[PDB]
Design an enzyme around this catalytic site. Structure first.
Site, mmCIF file in Angstrom:
data_model
loop_
_atom_site.group_PDB
_atom_site.id
_atom_site.type_symbol
_atom_site.label_atom_id
_atom_site.label_comp_id
_atom_site.label_asym_id
_atom_site.label_seq_id
_atom_site.Cartn_x
_atom_site.Cartn_y
_atom_site.Cartn_z
ATOM 1 N N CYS A 105 18.901 -11.553 10.822
ATOM 2 C CA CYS A 105 19.073 -12.765 10.037
ATOM 3 C C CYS A 105 19.216 -12.378 8.579
ATOM 4 O O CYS A 105 18.327 -11.735 8.026
ATOM 5 C CB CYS A 105 17.873 -13.701 10.222
ATOM 6 N N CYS A 151 16.014 -14.430 6.537
ATOM 7 C CA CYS A 151 14.609 -14.083 6.715
ATOM 8 C C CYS A 151 14.406 -12.635 7.129
ATOM 9 O O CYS A 151 13.262 -12.160 7.123
ATOM 10 C CB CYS A 151 13.937 -15.020 7.717
ATOM 11 N N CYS A 163 12.108 2.443 -4.772
ATOM 12 C CA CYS A 163 13.338 2.658 -4.023
ATOM 13 C C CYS A 163 14.365 1.615 -4.423
ATOM 14 O O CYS A 163 14.022 0.459 -4.676
ATOM 15 C CB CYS A 163 13.100 2.603 -2.509
ATOM 16 N N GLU A 213 11.724 6.615 -9.396
ATOM 17 C CA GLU A 213 11.023 7.627 -8.621
ATOM 18 C C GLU A 213 12.035 8.567 -7.965
ATOM 19 O O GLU A 213 13.070 8.131 -7.454
ATOM 20 C CB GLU A 213 10.139 6.926 -7.588
#
Ligand SMILES: Cc1cc(-n2nccn2)cc(C(=O)NNS(=O)(=O)c2ccccc2)c1F
Ligand code: NA
Ligand SMILES: [Zn+2]
Length: 268
Positions: A34, A37, A140, A174
């Site tokens: 989906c 969601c 990330c 990072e």
């Protein structure tokens, strides 16, 4: 067998890396997601049924940026655990070095969406440690393949630094960065520093941009715009040299700009 292929929204996307979806999901030929969601499913029929049921038309969390149809949602890993875990499993299909998927509470996630009449379609995201000891303004960062190299990653990079500015801090992503991540950060850094030099110590560049001095220095080295004098990096550039670099075809695509006016965000 691992998940090798996903269907999300109207895209089919081949995987790049192992992502630790449950064993029974990997065995499937294709995972269906989906786009709103981020629920992942095993079958087209459960996917089609969910689409008729799901009432989400945008990410959860707070919409902290909207300009035209470009939108960023802030999502706290503690307030929306399942959603953020699904996001991390999705991202790990396209990130080699991401290691954290289920311990999402220390992170906040910034979801980039492109909006139309039907909803806010997910493009990519970056995570950020609520408490970064090493001064990382990105943990990330991932752009889904059909959106890569199209200005969205540059937007998210610029967005992470605007947050750092509002926090009165410098920050760095990072490490290790993906290959595309390296080139993207270097290009963004160059653009920003060359633009500031066109219209200044290294410390001033760092305070105006929230780029760390190390990242500034390493970029100015790759541009051959720094002198060394008795243990100190010093900026050595002529305003014409700056302009020559900017005219190059690297910095020729018109960015999606981050309009600070449209960023509704106060620092924690
Ligand atoms: C940090 C990052 C990561 C990833 N990524 N890593 C794994 C999966 N996806 C993709 C992109 C991207 O899409 N870059 N291309 S760009 O937006 O056009 C762009 C143009 C000029 C300067 C900077 C970016 C990216 F910026
Ligand atoms: Na693909
Ligand atoms: Zn849904």
């Amino acid at each position: 067998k691992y998940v090798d292929k996903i269907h999300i929204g109207n895209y089919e996307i081949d995987a790049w890396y192992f992502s630790p979806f449950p064993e029974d999901y990997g065995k499937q030929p294709k995972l269906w997601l989906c786009e709103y969601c981020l629920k992942y499913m095993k079958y087209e029929k459960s996917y089609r049924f969910h689409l008729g049921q799901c009432q989400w038309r945008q990410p959860p969390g707070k919409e902290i940026y909207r300009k035209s149809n470009i939108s960023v949602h802030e999502v706290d890993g503690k307030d929306h655990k399942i959603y953020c875990q699904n996001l991390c499993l999705l991202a790990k299909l396209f990130l080699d070095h991401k290691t954290l998927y289920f311990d999402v509470e220390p992170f906040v996630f910034y979801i980039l969406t492109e909006v139309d009449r039907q909803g806010a379609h997910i493009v990519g995201y970056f995570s950020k440690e609520k408490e970064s000891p090493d001064g990382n303004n990105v943990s990330c960062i991932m752009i889904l393949p059909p959106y890569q190299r199209r200005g969205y990653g540059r937007f998210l990079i610029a967005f992470s630094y605007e947050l750092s500015k509002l926090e009165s801090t410098v920050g760095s992503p990072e490490k290790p960065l993906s290959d595309l991540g390296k080139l993207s950060y270097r290009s963004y850094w160059s653009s920003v520093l060359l633009e500031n030099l066109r219209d200044l110590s290294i410390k001033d560049l760092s305070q105006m941009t929230s780029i760390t001095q190390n990242d500034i220095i390493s970029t100015l080295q790759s541009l051959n715009m720094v002198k060394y004098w008795k243990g100190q990096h010093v900026i050595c550039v002529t305003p014409k040299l700056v302009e020559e670099h900017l005219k190059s075809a690297q910095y020729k695509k018109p960015p999606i700009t981050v309009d600070s006016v449209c960023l509704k965000w106060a620092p924690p």
